[PDB]
Design a protein around this ligand. Structure first.
Ligand SMILES: c1ccc(C2CCN(CCc3cc4ccccc4[nH]3)CC2)cc1
Ligand SMILES: c1ccc(C2CCN(CCc3cc4ccccc4[nH]3)CC2)cc1
Ligand SMILES: c1ccc(C2CCN(CCc3cc4ccccc4[nH]3)CC2)cc1
Ligand SMILES: c1ccc(C2CCN(CCc3cc4ccccc4[nH]3)CC2)cc1
Ligand SMILES: c1ccc(C2CCN(CCc3cc4ccccc4[nH]3)CC2)cc1
Lengths: 205, 205, 205, 205, 205
């Protein structure tokens, strides 16, 4: 406990918190989705409710340490409030996202951070054809709300959504689930915009 | 990181926070709406739910800096809690507004602030005739709750609501969406009152 | 900005906050209601939902200042959290009251405070007869939760509820709306209890 | 104001807050209920919703003062957050309790505290027979969550629930409402467990 | 009070809070469930709502004291916010868990902590066959969100869920309720992961 108390004190009480990335010091954020369930489909409002884990990874030099100086500690768990976290948001939500898991991150000695919030999301989705064999496709983009591709570079490790934890007795069957990194440019702005498009093809089980 | 940490420290930890505008030092707030969806229409209570982005822009001398003194930083992102924000509100909401995005603003070296909260709004709207070709018109005024025209001047860049992000498979089709700055004079009071009237004409797709 | 920053610092950072009134130093609170809408009526639970502005006015010697000493500032806007506010409550609510507006007050150099929260209230009301020409009458009392008339004296400027902002396409038509100051004494206790009785007669439009 | 500011400073800023009772220094908490309304009955989930005032009284030596030393102040009102409050809870609630009133307590010079929160409670109750003349009986136990009878001596003043404020046009009529205290010892443990069983017999009006 | 004030000050104001367990200093957390009611079953979304008490026990050397040095105090009650608590979560919830009880723990002089939060949980469960004699089986895993078996060792005192407080007039009858410790391994990671699988077999009463 003494070595970990010392490490946390040196990392969090000595210097001000990381102020976020800039064009000169960009940050790469890796996103991955683990879809657990399609909990609700509302055909009268065109809202669909998903339960998923959103894996977020990034690396900060300010979070690095030599394990030899701290009783061979290679990683620790800490409240996500103690650290800077990226402002990754769903771009077409209809309700505030509901957090289903403790807000705790894992920090590794190389400065790597892994934060996996479990969430319930209501987003814009026309479910017409969900009761058919072909099913229905719905998509929701995720990205930084305030940082462009010049400050936050969004990435995925795979374009395949993790369906290994998908509820087997769900009302809905997943035909396909992909997470695709997209780089967009708008007429307004010279900076690129990055999002991860979560595309889910599903039908009634 | 060091230059941004220094900038934020100089802007936020040296002087007290901006106390808001006065008649002697008025502030101009530019409002713009990006309508995403008409998520719900309730004909039994006369409530309509909107999902939109509300772009807010203002400029403070106290937020200015010389980029040359701070490693050529021309702008940064910071929690909206670190800065003063205008008390812009819907004058005919029926439920507290639901924030759908991170509460983060972009501050530019010229003292400009851009704050774009995504919101879900429930407001007073009689949807009689939504199921017709003519559709229905509904309006909601936005403005400062406590500041008159003498302290906060409200403006728009365009009278046209941005409909380029409007949900393509929405239950409702937008016939027209305008955002108009209105000035109101009362016999009682010498001070003018300013609002932005969001007028949306819509029908069932 | 500098003069207002100085004023706020002198009023709020020099002395402890106003500890509320006492029998020796009573406070008069003026109440006024502006009814915007009867949003929902529930005949299965006997609950009615109102949307209104509740104007609250009081005066504190501790909030007084000479405008000449502060660059001729005669009033300012401040977060209601910076000041003491009366504990005015609805005595027959069925749900926690929902705040629809920014929590900001206007302080005048004579020590006057004006606080106008917009609220959504669910209260006990049998709506039987709302669908008739005669309509239905419903009442809700407002007053201090913990202070008697010896500490907080409630007053009204008028017995007429402001209906000039009442939603013209509401499901309900207002036949009459009054706000009356009422006094009561209990056998135990000598102190009077004050409430403002909001009586609304309404029917379906 | 000055004398009350001085009193509050002496009571709350000089010594640490009361750490709660112990076996060596037990505390008597007097509990009583004022039933306002049976708002809802749900026969599909077996949940009943009550609106009531829960009167809590206790006395602390650390909250005592000589009125002569403080401008003859015999009592004051303060935020329930400034003082220790007992952890009295419903043992069979189905939803978090909703607070309908300001969280303010009355402290008397003898160290007496009176705290009367208004609340909405959903609790386990089978309402089968509510639509009959006989009605239905439902019960909810209240007590300390973590303190035994050795630390918190939970008491009542009367076994009769105050029905003098019960909503006259409620959907439900009260046939009887009692608050019976119970002291129990289990074979495991030497300490008594105390609870108050709020028993309400009611039917449709 | 003085001895307890002194004890709390020595335990909580002298050293930094316990930073959580590590591989070198693991922690055993014992979990136990007391099922109170199956409040709701939703066959359209496949969600079931449970009301239960979750007993959590763990032991910290940093929470030890000699009762002889503190007026023979052998245990005390304190806000769960004053101490470190394990991040035990339901792995298949569909809504944020609702806390129904005060967040207070019991600390014993041997460093033992007992924390029993009452909760309402919505979780993934297909209730098809609940209206039959055979009933339906539903399961929910609980475990640490961020810690492995190397840091938090989860244990049970019994595999039998406590049904002695189960609501007698519930819509649902419990056929069986077990809580089983399970050790899992993931392809990513060499460390074992522990969960407690709450398996409830139930039917309509
Ligand atoms: C966040 C944290 C834990 C989980 C777990 C899922 C399965 N195990 C743990 C299995 C587990 C996943 C996992 C994902 C990335 C890296 C390491 C990981 N270990 C218990 C909780 C889910 C989301
Ligand atoms: C309001 C409007 C769009 C957004 C974005 C939605 C898609 N992108 C990039 C699209 C985008 C245009 C744009 C115009 C002005 C300022 C920021 C902007 N971001 C990232 C955030 C956030 C808030
Ligand atoms: C609380 C509740 C509602 C408001 C206003 C409602 C409509 N207007 C301006 C309408 C308005 C005239 C007027 C005349 C004298 C004093 C205050 C006044 N407000 C802007 C906001 C402000 C604060
Ligand atoms: C708890 C319970 C009710 C209230 C009130 C609701 C109606 N009154 C009546 C207030 C009131 C009666 C009374 C009778 C005997 C002794 C003290 C009393 N206070 C003012 C506030 C406030 C706090
Ligand atoms: C967590 C879970 C339940 C409770 C209680 C439920 C019922 N009682 C009596 C609680 C109670 C019996 C009992 C019997 C033997 C040993 C210890 C015991 N505690 C008071 C609160 C408190 C905290």
């Amino acid at each position: 406990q003494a070595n970990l108390m010392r490490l946390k004190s040196d990392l969090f009480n000595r210097s001000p918190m990381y102020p976020g990335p800039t064009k000169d010091d960009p940050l790469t954020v890796t996103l991955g989705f683990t879809l657990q369930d399609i909990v609700k489909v509302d055909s009268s409002t065109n809202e669909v409710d998903l339960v998923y884990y959103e894996q977020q990874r990034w690396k900060l030099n300010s979070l690095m340490w030599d394990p030899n100086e701290y009783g061979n500690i290679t990683d620790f768990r800490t409240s996500a409030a103690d650290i800077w976290t990226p402002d990754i948001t769903a771009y077409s939500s209809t309700r505030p996202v509901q957090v289903l898991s403790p807000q705790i991150a894992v920090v590794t000695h190389d400065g790597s951070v892994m934060f996996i919030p479990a969430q319930r999301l209501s987003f814009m989705c026309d479910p017409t054809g969900v009761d058919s064999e072909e099913g229905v496709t719905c998509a929701v983009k995720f990205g930084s709300w305030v940082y462009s591709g010049f400050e936050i570079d969004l990435k995925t490790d795979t374009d395949q959504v993790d369906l290994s934890s998908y509820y087997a007795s769900s009302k809905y069957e997943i035909l396909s689930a992909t997470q695709t990194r997209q780089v967009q440019h708008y007429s307004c702005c010279p900076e690129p915009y990055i999002d991860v498009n979560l595309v889910v093809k599903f039908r009634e089980r």
